[PDB]
């Protein structure tokens, strides 16, 4: 590419980042802004592990 500043859009350089989340079968890894919140037992509950 010979990029030049006086190029019409669609010929100017774009930077690209491709995030690819993979989950082969690990036991746990990165996440997001969770909360932890304690747990319980013996009660019908709505859970996320």
């Amino acid at each position: 590419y010979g990029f030049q500043p006086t190029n019409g859009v669609g010929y100017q350089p774009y930077r690209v980042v491709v995030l690819s989340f993979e989950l082969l079968h690990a036991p746990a890894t990165v996440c997001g802004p969770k909360k932890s919140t304690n747990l319980v037992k013996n009660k019908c509950v709505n859970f996320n592990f």
Binding site: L24, H25, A26, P27
Partner: peptide, 24 residues
Amino acid sequence: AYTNSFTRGVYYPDKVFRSSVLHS
């Protein structure tokens, strides 16, 4: 030389627990 395996080279195809289950 060459030799004969008999029943060798079986690995767990992945995580996920499992019990008595003739899984295919």
